[PDB]
Fold endothiapepsin.
Amino acid sequence: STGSATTTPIDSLDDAYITPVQIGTPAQTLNLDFDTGSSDLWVFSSETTASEVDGQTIYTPSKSTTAKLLSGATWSISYGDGSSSSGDVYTDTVSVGGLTVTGQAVESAKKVSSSFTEDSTIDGLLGLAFSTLNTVSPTQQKTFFDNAKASLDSPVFTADLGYHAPGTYNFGFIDTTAYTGSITYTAVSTKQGFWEWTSTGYAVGSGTFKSTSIDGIADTGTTLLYLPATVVSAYWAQVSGAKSSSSVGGYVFPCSATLPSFTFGVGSARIVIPGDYIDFGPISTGSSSCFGGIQSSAGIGINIFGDVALKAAFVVFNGATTPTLGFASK
């Protein structure tokens, strides 16, 4: 089997991407944030504290003939930005782009933190990191991908995020028309439950490539590119007027600037992030100070190849017995 679904930016900045997901019988379609940095499939629901729902589409398990309460199971998750959600668990039929999993753990939110409430466009998350990070207790649950894997033509999914445009998540096959050149594969460590890999270095604009190992995670659920302070400083030094602002919480730059590209290494190959991808617009409405798309990972404790990086590539999440990551230009 295979699946193929379009993923769409939630706003003009590509702050996140939503992908339609069919849950239950009859189908209830929710727009979920596919997140290769976490491993819970959770949804706004009929059980969500009413004051914490503001425009999201909710899953109502009582209206699904295939929903079954997973007795005793609870979940609770905290994300790197300080947001959180928690609740109980159903199993139900979940389909993505024509690909169907029966008995998928659907984590029903009883509580969500303010940033989820305040984002009316995201109805939940669909985790695609390794199932070892799944927060369901006392019986940990498998991701959608993990459940689908055996049925897939090939045990892979691919992320093809658009810049200011829709893209595609495919399951079970590699669309050879979706990228240019060849796919370069690179080793993955699953020891932290992430799609963790080592970039071979970077360049800023037309500058020379610096060969240096950068361990990080391929994370579709993170907006920006978080890299070591040395790297990030070298990037923003090429932008006149750019500075790190503690009050804003990162590098800002004059909105009048033309940003240089940023290249990262995948083995001997190179992925080029165009400068425009690194502009996340005024820090506040009407401001001429713009927020940078490359930020320091210092104090996060991990480097994160988020959407800014991933949207410059066709990315293969290879879930073979020994997982690997593939990157191609596109």
Notes: Residues 229-236 form the longest helix (8 residues). The radius of gyration is 20 Å. The chain has two domains: 5-174, 175-330.
